[PDB]
Design a protein around this motif. Structure first.
Motif, PDB file in Angstrom:
ATOM      1  N   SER A  32      16.601 -12.997 -92.668  1.00  0.00           N
ATOM      2  CA  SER A  32      18.562 -13.612 -92.566  1.00  0.00           C
ATOM      3  C   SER A  32      18.735 -12.200 -91.902  1.00  0.00           C
ATOM      4  O   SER A  32      19.852 -12.573 -91.082  1.00  0.00           O
ATOM      5  CB  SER A  32      18.919 -14.465 -93.696  1.00  0.00           C
ATOM      6  N   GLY A  35      18.085 -10.617 -89.148  1.00  0.00           N
ATOM      7  CA  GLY A  35      17.596 -11.273 -87.647  1.00  0.00           C
ATOM      8  C   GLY A  35      19.264 -11.408 -87.440  1.00  0.00           C
ATOM      9  O   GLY A  35      19.001 -11.344 -85.843  1.00  0.00           O
ATOM     10  N   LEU A  36      19.897 -11.601 -88.209  1.00  0.00           N
ATOM     11  CA  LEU A  36      21.557 -11.565 -87.536  1.00  0.00           C
ATOM     12  C   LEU A  36      22.513 -10.052 -87.333  1.00  0.00           C
ATOM     13  O   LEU A  36      22.851 -10.028 -86.339  1.00  0.00           O
ATOM     14  CB  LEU A  36      21.982 -11.764 -88.744  1.00  0.00           C
ATOM     15  N   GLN A  38      20.125  -7.677 -85.712  1.00  0.00           N
ATOM     16  CA  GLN A  38      19.161  -7.588 -84.100  1.00  0.00           C
ATOM     17  C   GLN A  38      20.549  -8.525 -84.069  1.00  0.00           C
ATOM     18  O   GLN A  38      20.441  -7.745 -83.067  1.00  0.00           O
ATOM     19  CB  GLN A  38      17.537  -7.892 -84.183  1.00  0.00           C
ATOM     20  N   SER A  39      20.159  -9.961 -83.571  1.00  0.00           N
ATOM     21  CA  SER A  39      20.765 -10.494 -82.340  1.00  0.00           C
ATOM     22  C   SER A  39      22.750  -9.821 -82.196  1.00  0.00           C
ATOM     23  O   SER A  39      22.861  -9.230 -81.194  1.00  0.00           O
ATOM     24  CB  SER A  39      21.113 -11.837 -82.675  1.00  0.00           C
ATOM     25  N   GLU A  42      21.595  -6.553 -80.164  1.00  0.00           N
ATOM     26  CA  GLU A  42      21.207  -7.125 -78.625  1.00  0.00           C
ATOM     27  C   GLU A  42      22.638  -7.564 -77.892  1.00  0.00           C
ATOM     28  O   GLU A  42      22.867  -6.932 -77.211  1.00  0.00           O
ATOM     29  CB  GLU A  42      19.850  -8.235 -78.991  1.00  0.00           C
ATOM     30  N   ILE A  43      23.882  -8.480 -78.502  1.00  0.00           N
ATOM     31  CA  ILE A  43      24.643  -9.071 -77.623  1.00  0.00           C
ATOM     32  C   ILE A  43      25.783  -7.741 -77.482  1.00  0.00           C
ATOM     33  O   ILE A  43      26.244  -7.646 -76.140  1.00  0.00           O
ATOM     34  CB  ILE A  43      25.493  -9.580 -78.598  1.00  0.00           C
ATOM     35  N   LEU A  46      25.116  -5.940 -74.897  1.00  0.00           N
ATOM     36  CA  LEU A  46      25.676  -6.043 -73.269  1.00  0.00           C
ATOM     37  C   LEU A  46      26.780  -5.480 -72.986  1.00  0.00           C
ATOM     38  O   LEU A  46      27.025  -5.189 -70.897  1.00  0.00           O
ATOM     39  CB  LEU A  46      26.187  -7.638 -73.417  1.00  0.00           C
ATOM     40  N   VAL A  57      33.684  -8.379 -81.818  1.00  0.00           N
ATOM     41  CA  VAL A  57      31.996  -9.267 -82.612  1.00  0.00           C
ATOM     42  C   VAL A  57      31.867  -9.116 -84.079  1.00  0.00           C
ATOM     43  O   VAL A  57      31.758 -10.087 -84.493  1.00  0.00           O
ATOM     44  CB  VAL A  57      31.173  -8.832 -81.361  1.00  0.00           C
ATOM     45  N   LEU A  63      29.772 -13.785 -88.916  1.00  0.00           N
ATOM     46  CA  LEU A  63      29.383 -12.082 -89.383  1.00  0.00           C
ATOM     47  C   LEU A  63      29.915 -11.231 -90.145  1.00  0.00           C
ATOM     48  O   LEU A  63      29.478 -10.533 -90.794  1.00  0.00           O
ATOM     49  CB  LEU A  63      29.566 -11.510 -87.868  1.00  0.00           C
TER      50      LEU A  63
END
Ligand SMILES: [Ca+2]
Ligand SMILES: [Ca+2]
Lengths: 236, 236
Positions: A32, A35-36, A38-39, A42-43, A46, A57, A63
């Motif tokens: 988990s 996954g956090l 990684q996202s 990716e965000i 941008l 962020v 987070l």
């Protein structure tokens, strides 16, 4: 006679069930967290050079509440955005030199570092590192720090109390988590001498008390979860 | 005589250990999905009315790969941003009317919906819904859809094969996940008649075969995890 071996069966079966339960806990927490990470990466990709966006962020509460600290170091100007309230980087802090940065850049994917000394808390930690790309160009790396006392509390979720404890090491036997954090970053042999690092159960003697050591491996990072159990107390 | 009760002990203890292991799997998957949803929502709240930013976030691969579908419906113009490749909303689709939106708006926090018919896949799904705020003003809601066949595969991770299966229901006995998806959204009694929805083990008869039902509750959402076990096959 046969009861001895029956009792031995019960003991070994229950140790392995206890350890695999803990192993799933660790795997689930790690996945988990990954996954956090990684996202989040990716965000941020941008608009990775947008320091104001990046800070916003990393300061978002869920987070921020999921890791000891998060930051992004840039390849160009060695600058760093981070969400550590009680730490600002020195004039000679260079993220590009840090193990989370080097590991992420070397592997070009999400990595979990070996234990290392945190600049901020001056303690042994581990980090999730990720590379950051701007349209296929490497522009820097991120760290997601993991506090090791918290990790030690997690593997000792199940409470063995005075009957014993659980710990975590890397594949090379370097301690990742232990009830006494002083062991972290050191070879586990300093609190468990003459014990092989392998899956299975070992029986050891000190004084004239017997102890059971059970290891189980976490496939994702090749960590070992170990349990040390006092037979006399745990199976009285 | 005493062996019968010894065997019964083994059977009940192993059922409960099997089910609690599955319960932890579900809890871990749900918590990690909720954590992702929570962070995604908070990140979108940096600029919630920015449809281009919102779409970019929802299309990022790790997040997109973690849910069947994700979307954001707006309170003002009933518009919707979503990452479903094979679905575009009709001229009369109104997100404000959908159960994920209504639940999130009512509770003002992250919610998991009851089972309901998905507009896109025309199947029973559940969703994580979250409210979206623009400086303390409610500007809309998000859905994070969960595919129920995937959930059924997960609770049946452990493979009971021909010995039986596991399933999930809500607190009211509405089926959430089952090897036959046709049961989803219906009362579980249609495949398990005269079985009470409560923690513990029940023994039932059909034909002259005996079956064991074990329920365990998932505290976070008050789901029940059920296991149906054929005694003759499972303990031969
Ligand atoms: Ca700081
Ligand atoms: Ca679409």
């Amino acid at each position: 006679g046969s009861v001895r071996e029956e009792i031995e069966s019960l003991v070994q079966d229950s140790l392995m069930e206890m350890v695999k339960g803990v192993k799933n806990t660790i795997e689930s927490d790690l996945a988990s967290k990954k996954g956090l990470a990684q996202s989040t990466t990716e965000i941020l990709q941008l608009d990775p050079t947008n320091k104001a966006f990046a800070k916003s962020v990393l300061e978002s509460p869920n987070l921020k509440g999921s890791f000891l600290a998060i930051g992004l170091g840039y390849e160009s100007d060695a600058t760093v955005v981070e969400n550590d309230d009680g730490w600002e980087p020195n004039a000679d802090y260079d993220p590009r030199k840090r193990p989370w940065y080097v590991d992420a850049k070397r592997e070009r994917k999400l990595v979990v570092t070996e234990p290392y000394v945190d600049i901020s808390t001056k303690k042994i930690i581990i980090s999730i590192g990720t590379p950051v790309y701007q349209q296929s160009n490497f522009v820097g790396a991120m760290f997601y720090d993991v506090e090791l006392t918290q990790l030690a509390q997690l593997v000792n979720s199940v409470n063995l109390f005075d009957a014993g404890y659980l710990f975590i090491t890397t594949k090379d036997g370097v301690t990742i988590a232990h009830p006494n954090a002083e062991n972290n970053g050191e070879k586990f042999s300093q609190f468990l001498p003459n014990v092989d690092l392998k899956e299975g159960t070992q029986r050891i003697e000190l004084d004239g008390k017997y102890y059971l050591v059970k290891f189980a491996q976490v496939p994702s990072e090749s960590w070992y979860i170990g349990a040390v159990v006092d037979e006399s107390i745990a199976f009285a």
